[PDB]
Ligand binder design. Sequence first.
Ligand SMILES: [Zn+2]
Ligand SMILES: [Zn+2]
Lengths: 306, 306
Amino acid sequence: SGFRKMAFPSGKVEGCMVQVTCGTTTLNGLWLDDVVYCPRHVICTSEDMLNPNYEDLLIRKSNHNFLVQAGNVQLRVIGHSMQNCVLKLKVDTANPKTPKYKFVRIQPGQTFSVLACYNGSPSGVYQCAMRPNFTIKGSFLNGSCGSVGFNIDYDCVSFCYMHHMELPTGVHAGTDLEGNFYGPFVDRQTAQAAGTDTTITVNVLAWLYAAVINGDRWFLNRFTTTLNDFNLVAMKYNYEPLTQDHVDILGPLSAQTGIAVLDMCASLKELLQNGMNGRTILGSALLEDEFTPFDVVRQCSGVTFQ
Amino acid sequence: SGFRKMAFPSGKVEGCMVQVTCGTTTLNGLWLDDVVYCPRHVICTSEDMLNPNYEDLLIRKSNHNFLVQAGNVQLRVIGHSMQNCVLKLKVDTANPKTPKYKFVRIQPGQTFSVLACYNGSPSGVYQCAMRPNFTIKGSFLNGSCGSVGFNIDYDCVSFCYMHHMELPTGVHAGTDLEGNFYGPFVDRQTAQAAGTDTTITVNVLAWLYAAVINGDRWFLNRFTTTLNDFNLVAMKYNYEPLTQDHVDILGPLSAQTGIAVLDMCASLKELLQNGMNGRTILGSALLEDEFTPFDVVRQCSGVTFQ
Ligand SMILES: [Zn+2]
Ligand SMILES: [Zn+2]
């Protein structure tokens, strides 16, 4: 028993991180097969970032202007191209440690593990969620750009995030591995507004089911409610509205605990209107929304990977 | 910027986990050089665990009674021995993926990463602290026994914990890699009492310094205090007393923020007597004690590993 904010094992990804250097800028890249992916602003100086013309900047660079260093070995750049906001550097050596991988564009509310890297070396790993406003609340210092987020399904690595920038508000923004930003952000150093950050209601509910499985049941009241009356209360507290798809995803958890989804919603409503009153749930005095329904079943059943 | 409960990259450890089977019981083992370490109760049945005579049970077992499986390959057991509460199985093949490693017995309040494994396959990784009562609050299901905790220093892996059992209270207990339990526990299925769990005060202080570095400064009052007057208040709330060694360890953080240790203590005292009043610090409504002073500097400077 017990419940922890758990990350995926990072072994398969550690063998794919490289150091990419262009001119003076150095950041991290992802080496899969014979191509290296990295943020395109590796070609910018501190002054270029205020208003960069990436096309014009990329024309001035040749294949030999890029230094790719795998741990302590240099890959030869024989081809470069720009796909949206990432650079694809084609090198001469295919990564012998390339795992089975896919590129995926996740949706808000989904979770993934981040391997924070500096100078192409892994520093730590943590689990987080894509917020409804397409930001993440991560931990990144200068030089962490190019760090990637990922999920693991059995033996396959699903890359879903590449880190690009910290906004003036302290939150973080990035792209999928095709270089398309999550959210309305651009790789430029300017004031950019993130929308209202809402709470991922389906994840809160999944967490409450985890609490029941692990012995915390004080929050279970004997009331019930309807989807409409619940969403009316949720919206007042900046909670994402609940749909039937969400109710369907929670089905396995409802069956294992004998607690109907709508009954759990009635419990959550009471917590929103009345608060926790100095109590905790799974050791927390706030409602957690960084566990999906799939995360809860994985941790409460013991799923493994290769 | 930002602050996350961060674990070490687990790559170096993933290549060391094996499946150990004796009779019907199967759990995880740690394969370093030509020896495999695992909990000795792998030789017990469900009925043996109530009152096991490990010496007498081990006599009935021969080298060929143990099945060691590395992923999908079998190591031949050519020697077995019992060191305290662990079994040392000497095999015929040295692990080609053996990293530089040490065995270390950590002290309460120190943190480490756990790689939770089932059937010798990694499931996830999380960071936790050894409580002052020598328990950990982990996430473990049946078959997770033999999972290890570890730290990383540059390129060397320090193994500090092997998981052995869940107490009837839901908390977890285990040994160092020499088989000596942390705490007064024994590998027997009986009611065992853990002492009072106290809050690791030096870690709370380090966390408060992390908050200041990251922009949360509302809790900074303009009072001060003495070590004696502070410890008098701490003890009333089940907080570990502060010593001069603790003040010395916090020195680098005091210098970087310009806030004297004793001034921070005065701020913490106020939080203990008055509470948070519905506010948060680094996104938390409780005081966190699972970050050491060393963890804070590592995450606020960008330390890396190989
Ligand atoms: Zn950058
Ligand atoms: Zn066991």
